[PDB]
């Protein structure tokens, strides 16, 4: 779409200063999620601990002792009452943060999948979309715990998930370089997204809701649509010879936050695919990344047990 | 203001301390992981422990706690979850000596010995387990010596020609598995004979993980 958008260009160099660095973890971080309040964020690490961090004061609200230390995903519900954590054990132990007691008690465990749990996202306090490593996704409940709708259309292992602003339809990419826009009402994909060549690792929706970014392990990102489904731009560059572990957008959908696994993050232009900023400072490969719904700061997580906040 | 934020920081600093011992309790214990292809003979290593998703086993021996993980049945490719175990003490391997004659029941064209050897190189030569030691076990040594007096053993390796004796082949295939590794300057490979007879080989893996944690302690001191 470079022939369109003649009015815009890379806005100098986006210099996001490191404001907060969350300390306390002792293992490799693998997942995180934000909320609308933009003050409490969940984070999962390989030490078997689920921490509810305070964004403004770098304090730990809750410390959930996980039963399985090999957790690979974690979600934060918009209500702020429940948080999920899936991993190799395939037991999505959804805990209850706001409880009458002091310790965090588990609300419902989800042990119906067979492949490794890769990503989970809370639709609401009743429905949750959780992917797995058996080339399928499923919609789960909390009060009873079952699979309302199982999406079986991918030939590769799912890696990441992403929810739309209305949470009625979601895209999801797999290791077979194939993404599909699944529906929550009827429960089946409408059109697939096959534009990459390597294992898709990260998926994130566009703030408008008519597009989404895709991050594969071939050192490039792409932006697909939901109406005509044709690739508009490619975030390819010869300076990147590494993989991709995370991708996200800002509040305005202009600065794409691409968490490349080369120890540094990259702030890409979501309209011209130009390098606008490079977030460096992480001592290890990043695995998770999330932008607040408010848009104030951006939290990046690496395997160095450090969660850096950029603003 | 320090009105209620002091109690919030005190609560955070309270679980900051609690999470510190939990990291130390997990650091003093040995974390092991075992791999293997179909019919890997892992029933031996999981039986010596005092006791969908993977199986995990706890067992304490010689005043030392071990955290062994059983992969079991994982249809997913290892490329997307083998980097999670980056940091284990010593990854365990279980190769079956009876895999030289029997072929895999997948395409009728791949030998089980070559398939297990292809999995040994895929696990060893990676960007995650460069430093972690490998402890491979030769399971079913009595079943292997019973078939070697009837088979020329050339089925797996056609370029080999030697003695059809257990002590000869157990040492020959030991050096063979010690040639597919390229990180001979960083990691260490252990080999032992496991079976139902002459059991209780945990003294070997206990001395093996003791060698690794000391090598890790030497890295803590800054001597390597």
């Amino acid at each position, epitope marked *: 779409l470079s022939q369109i958008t003649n009015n815009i260009d890379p806005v100098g160099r986006i210099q996001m200063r490191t404001r907060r660095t969350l300390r306390g973890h002792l293992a490799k971080i693998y997942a995180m999620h934000w909320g609308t309040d933009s*003050r409490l964020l969940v984070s999962a690490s390989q030490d078997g601990k689920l921490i509810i961090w*305070d964004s403004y004061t770098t*304090n730990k609200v809750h410390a959930i002792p996980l039963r399985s230390s090999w957790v690979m995903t974690c979600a934060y519900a918009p209500s702020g009452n429940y948080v999920a954590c899936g991993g190799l054990d395939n037991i999505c132990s959804i805990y209850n943060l706001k409880t*009458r007691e002091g310790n965090v008690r588990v609300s419902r465990e989800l042990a119906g999948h067979t492949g490794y749990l890769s990503c989970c996202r809370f639709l609401d306090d009743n429905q949750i979309v959780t992917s797995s490593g058996d080339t399928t996704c499923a919609l789960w409940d909390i009060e009873t715990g079952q699979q309302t709708t199982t999406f079986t259309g991918h030939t590769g292992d799912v890696m990441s998930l992403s929810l739309a602003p209305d949470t009625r339809l979601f895209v999801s990419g797999a290791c077979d370089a194939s993404a599909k826009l699944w529906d929550v009402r009827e429960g089946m994909c409408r059109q697939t997204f096959t534009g990459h060549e390597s294992d898709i690792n990260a998926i994130c929706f566009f703030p408008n809701g008519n597009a989404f970014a895709t991050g594969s392990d071939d050192a490039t990102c792409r932006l697909f649509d939901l109406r005509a489904d044709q690739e508009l731009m490619t975030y390819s560059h010869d300076n990147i010879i590494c993989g991709i572990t995370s991708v996200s957008f800002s509040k305005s959908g202009r600065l794409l936050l691409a968490g490349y696994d080369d120890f540094n993050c990259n702030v890409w232009d979501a309209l011209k695919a130009d390098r606008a900023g490079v977030l460096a400072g992480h001592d290890n490969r990043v695995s998770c990344l999330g932008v607040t719904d408010d848009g104030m700061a951006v939290a990046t997580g690496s395997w160095d047990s450090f969660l850096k906040i950029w603003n | 203001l320090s009105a209620e934020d002091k*109690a919030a920081v*005190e609560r955070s600093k309270m679980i900051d301390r609690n999470l510190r011992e939990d990291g130390e309790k997990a650091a003093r214990e040995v974390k092991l992981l075992l791999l293997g292809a179909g019919e890997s003979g892992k029933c031996t290593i999981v039986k010596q422990m005092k006791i969908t998703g993977i199986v995990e086993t706890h067992f304490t021996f010689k005043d030392l706690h071990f955290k062994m993980f059983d992969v079991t049945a994982q249809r997913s490719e290892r490329k997307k979850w083998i980097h999670c175990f980056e940091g284990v003490t010593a990854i365990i391997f279980c190769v079956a000596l009876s895999d030289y004659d029997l072929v895999l029941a997948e395409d009728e064209e791949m030998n089980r010995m070559h398939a297990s050897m292809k999995l040994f190189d895929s696990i060893c030569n990676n960007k995650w387990f460069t430093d972690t030691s490998i402890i491979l076990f030769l399971n079913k040594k009595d079943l292997f010596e019973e078939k070697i007096k009837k088979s020329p053993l050339t089925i797996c390796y056609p370029e080999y020609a030697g003695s059809n004796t257990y002590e000869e082949a157990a040492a020959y295939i030991q050096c063979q598995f010690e040639d597919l590794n390229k990180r001979k300057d960083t990691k260490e490979i252990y080999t032992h004979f496991t079976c139902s007879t002459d059991t209780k080989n945990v003294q070997f893996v206990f001395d093996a993980v003791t060698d690794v944690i000391i090598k890790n302690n030497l890295k803590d001191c800054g001597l390597f």
Partner: single-chain antibody, 233 residues
């Protein structure tokens, strides 16, 4: 089921000690800040002592500083309050309150039954400018409260807590942070205010809203409660 029962039933003679006990059940006693609130017959509440998780921060009120001693037992889930050098002003109920401190938390949720002990005969002043409002159900009721210091902080929230005490029962939280209702309270209590003046409006009053109202601040120690707005039918 959260439960806070106290023991030590009996009047004390001036010149000794009582050292009452308080056990907990239904919740993690180790991860809650225990508070002590006194209330003489038809009098305003008053904070006495507060201990945090792990006996780290132990604060006392100037009325009890140097006289009373608090000691908790995490393995026992029992709170021991050693009270020595007692006098006639120590006659109260000695409520035990639990509280956890974090963003979005609900401090002062559950109140203990208390032990009505009798004896053989600067700080932020919270004023309500009203002690009794006899109003039958049928119209809305609004209760205000003032403060000696502005409760508006730099982070944004206003630390204010409302407590309703029914005759023969223990108080319980109404609205924390001056705009957020606690768990188990219907959307009838709407808290408003700015800095010093505050307002608690009740759209429809029932038999559950008839009681004494207290406006407590959590800025500085010792904590001070309101004057007490009693309702009549």
């Amino acid at each position: 089921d959260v439960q806070l029962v106290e023991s030590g039933g009996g009047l004390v003679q001036p010149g000794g000690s009582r050292k009452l006990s308080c056990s907990a059940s239904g919740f993690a006693f180790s991860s809650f800040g225990m508070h002590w609130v006194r209330q003489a017959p038809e009098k305003g509440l008053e904070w006495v002592a507060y201990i945090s998780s792990g006996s780290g921060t132990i604060y006392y009120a100037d009325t009890v500083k140097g006289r009373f001693t608090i000691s908790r037992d995490d393995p026992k889930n029992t709170l021991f309050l050693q009270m020595t050098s007692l006098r006639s002003e120590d006659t109260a109920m000695y409520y035990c309150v639990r509280s956890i401190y974090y963003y979005g938390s609900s401090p002062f949720d559950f109140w203990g039954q208390g032990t009505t002990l009798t004896v053989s005969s600067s700080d932020i002043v919270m004023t309500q400018a009203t002690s009794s409002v006899p109003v039958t159900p049928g119209e809305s009721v609004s209760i205000s409260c003032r403060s000696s210091k502005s409760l508006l902080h730099s982070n944004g929230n206003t630390y204010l807590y409302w407590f309703l005490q029914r005759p023969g029962q223990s108080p319980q939280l109404l609205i924390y942070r001056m705009s957020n209702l606690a768990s188990g309270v219907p959307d009838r209590f709407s808290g408003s205010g700015s800095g010093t003046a505050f307002t608690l409006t009740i759209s429809r009053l029932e038999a559950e809203d008839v009681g004494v109202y207290y406006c407590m601040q959590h800025l500085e120690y010792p904590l001070t409660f309101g004057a007490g707005t009693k309702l009549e039918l």
